[PDB]
Design a protein around this ligand. Structure first.
Ligand code: AI2
Ligand code: CA
Length: 338
């Protein structure tokens, strides 16, 4: 149903050129809008940003700062909901975004819920769509893909974590998984990890629980999983809030021996890493996606071609890392968001 990130870029060489060009623009110093818009642009954001994870909040912060440094006049309406919830608000806010004739509508997709909405925008409106936290183009939309898919590739991050656990434990190691809520994130972060680990190290999956994408749910799921399968050496978590909940569970059960990962490397995760509560995590160079979105909008306003997809990079972080390594990474990742 989805194109792999590299698979997409290899299939369409011109897309790889565009993506590489955006990547270079993101790292290079700000080159302000060459053509001033006579109307400030209207931007609407609908993000499942109400979480312990600071990804969404930092994304808007870095995004707005880059828009500022690029001299782009804009009006931004923001709506933050909780993941796996607030279905009504999400629906009402998305419709309101189109009603207000926004120039750019930014949101995410984890379920099939808003696909028809996307199709409507693409076929009958002038509103451009930016889909955050997804870097795998939807095949059914090959004839007309959204303006931009942006994020930190889930498959890559999960492969990096899988490689690490593969080196930390011997063949046939017992483990359990804590998924996100049912959907895309669980599929691309969870099943990717399970597949590689089982295929390359013959690890033995003991259980895999779907969650409600919250810390409380991660805690509840970890306890349930360990009650039925205490003989595991590690637990792979598919998201920040869930992993932090699992941490609390391990502490309560006195099972600090069990390794647990974070997924994303935001401030709460890094604090847990330095505390030793989280053993490892794949840290994304966070602000790069917010910056990429501002650059993409800039190119659009300059009538330049914009890549269909853009994925930022990751850095593996462990509790054994020195404070200098952590500080150096924060300097890179939160250069704009602070
Ligand atoms: C961005 C994000 O994807 C799922 C969820 O929304 C999240 O915030 O949790 B995460 O930090 O693990 O990454
Ligand atoms: Ca269509």
């Amino acid at each position: 149903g989805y194109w792999g990130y590299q698979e997409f870029l290899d299939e369409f060489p011109e897309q790889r050129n565009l993506t590489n060009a955006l990547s270079e623009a993101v790292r290079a110093q700000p080159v302000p809008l060459s053509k001033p818009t006579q109307r400030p642009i209207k931007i609407s954001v609908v993000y499942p940003g109400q979480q312990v994870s600071d990804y969404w909040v930092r994304n808007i912060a870095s995004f707005e700062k880059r828009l500022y440094k690029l001299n782009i006049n804009y009006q931004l309406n923001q709506v933050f909901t909780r993941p796996n919830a607030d279905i009504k608000q999400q629906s009402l806010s998305l419709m309101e975004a189109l009603k207000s004739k926004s120039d750019y509508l930014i949101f995410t997709l984890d379920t099939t819920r808003h696909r028809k909405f996307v199709e409507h925008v693409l076929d009958s409106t002038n509103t451009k769509l930016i889909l955050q936290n997804i870097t795998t183009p939807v095949r059914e939309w090959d004839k007309h893909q959204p303006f931009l898919y942006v994020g930190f590739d889930h498959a890559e991050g999960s492969r990096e974590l899988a490689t690490e656990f593969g080196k930390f434990f011997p063949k046939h190691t017992y483990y359990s998984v804590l998924y996100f809520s049912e959907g895309y994130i669980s599929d691309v972060r969870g099943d990717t990890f399970i597949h590689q680990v089982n295929r390359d190290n013959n690890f033995e999956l003991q259980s895999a629980y779907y969650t409600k994408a919250t810390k409380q749910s991660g805690y509840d799921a970890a306890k349930a999983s360990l009650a039925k399968h205490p003989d595991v050496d590690f637990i792979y978590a598919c998201s920040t809030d869930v992993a932090l909940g699992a941490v609390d569970a391990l502490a309560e059960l006195g099972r600090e021996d069990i390794m647990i990962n974070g997924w994303g490397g935001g401030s709460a995760e890094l604090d847990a890493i330095q505390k030793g509560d989280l053993d490892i995590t794949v840290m994304r160079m966070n602000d790069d996606t917010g910056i990429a979105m501002a650059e993409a909008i800039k190119w659009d306003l300059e009538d330049k071609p914009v890549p269909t997809v853009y994925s930022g990079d990751f850095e593996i972080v462990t509790k054994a890392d020195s404070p200098e390594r952590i500080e150096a990474l924060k300097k890179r990742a939160f250069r704009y968001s602070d």
